[PDB]
Amino acid sequence: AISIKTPEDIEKMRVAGRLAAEVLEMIEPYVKPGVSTGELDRICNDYIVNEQHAVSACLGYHGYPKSVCISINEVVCHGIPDDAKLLKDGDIVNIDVTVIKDGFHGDTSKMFIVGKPTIMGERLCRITQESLYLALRMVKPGINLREIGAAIQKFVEAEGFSVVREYCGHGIGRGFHEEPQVLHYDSRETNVVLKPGMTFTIEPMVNAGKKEIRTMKDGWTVKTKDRSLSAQYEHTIVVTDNGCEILTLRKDDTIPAIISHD
């Protein structure tokens, strides 16, 4: 079944979420032309281990070889940090972090635009983040995840973009991926009504082109089949009595931590 976090667990999630968000805030200045994704990963891991006294939940997860996932341009997700992969002017890059602290996971990612942004890159990232934001604003007890997934897809598709179907958001807590699955599109299979205390992620993967993807032969790197740009933003949240609280909010987020309804 689905778990409803206790006040104590929610506090631990706040701590874990804050740490994950802080890794993204910390790494930002390093995401510039010339840097390798491999070094960004090491910088993130050193910070997580030595500064936050936490641990990356990604390393070893289903065999994932690195500490954080770094995906560039057409790479949709699971990009493997490589000391030989350099960021360049115009690149859009997603750094996805998941830390475990005091037994709980904080999961979040954001897009970084490297050097001079390309209007398409800016547009895709902005729209992708806005799709996450619109979804967050819908979160509150009584709402069905199907409605949220449908809303995300409708928005994204109205922009001329597509939503990746192979991946979804997820419940989170002592487990990296717990129930329920949080699809970012409309599916007849989705029937999960939100309840206070639920902690999960919303992390839409949006392609500028077609939805189809391909996994490279390193068994991890996923790219858009048409090699169009793909962007993703992710936040871990806790459903409150009248909305939700974003546990991985950053200083650069343009949405409040506490979203209240009435």
Ligand X SMILES: O=C(O)c1ccc(-c2ccccc2Cl)o1
Please report, in range form, the residues annotated as the binding site for substrate.
78, 177
Report the nearest approach of Mn ion to the CB of residue 97 (Å). Answer: 7
For the chain, the first-to-last Cα distance in angstroms comes to: 29
Report the nearest approach of Mn ion to the CB of residue 199 (Å). Answer: 12
What, of Mn ion, Na ion, ligand X, none, does residue 230 touch, CB below 5 to 8 Å by kind?
Na ion
Return the bridge partners of 71, or none.
94
What, of Na ion, ligand X, Mn ion, none, does residue 22 touch, CB below 5 to 8 Å by kind?
none
Interacting residues toward ligand X by CB under 6 A? 58, 61-62, 64, 69, 78, 96, 107, 170, 203, 234
Q: Do 98 and 106 contact (CB within 8 A), yes or no?
A: yes
Interface mask (CB under 5 A) for Na ion, residues 225-254, using x and -?
-----x------------------------
Interacting residues toward Mn ion by CB under 5 A? 96, 107, 109, 201, 203, 234
Give the β-pairing of 162-163 and 205-207. Answer: antiparallel
Report the nearest approach of Mn ion to the CB of residue 17 (Å). Answer: 12
| CB closer to Na ion, 135 vs 208 | 208
What, of Mn ion, ligand X, Na ion, none, does residue 199 touch, CB below 5 to 8 Å by kind?
none
Question: Is position 129 an interface residue for Na ion (rule: CB under 5 A)?
Answer: no
| CB closer to ligand X, 59 vs 117 | 59
Binding to Na ion, residues 75-114 (CB under 5 A): 75
Furthest C-alpha separation in the chain: 51
Q: d(Cα 77, Cα 73) in Å, to the nearest integer?
A: 10
Q: d(Cα 153, Cα 66) in Å, to the nearest integer?
A: 30
Angle at 171 between CA 165 and CA 174, to 5 degrees: 135
What, of ligand X, Na ion, Mn ion, none, does residue 131 touch, CB below 5 to 8 Å by kind?
none
Q: Which residues 6+ apart lie within 8 Å of 29 measured at CB? A: none
What residues are designated binding site for a divalent metal cation? 96, 107, 170, 203, 234
Q: Rg of the Cα trace of the chain?
A: 17
| CB closer to ligand X, 197 vs 204 | 204
Exposed, middle or buried: residue 252 (CB in 10 Å: 0-12, 13-18, 19+)? Answer: exposed
The owner of tokens 């598709």 is 157
DSSP assignment of 186-228: --TT---B--TT-EEEE--EEESS-S-EEE-TTSS-EEETT--
The SS3 of residue 42 is helix
Report the nearest approach of ligand X to the CB of residue 95 (Å). Answer: 11
| CB closer to Na ion, 125 vs 238 | 125
Binding site for Na ion (CB under 5 A): 71, 75, 230
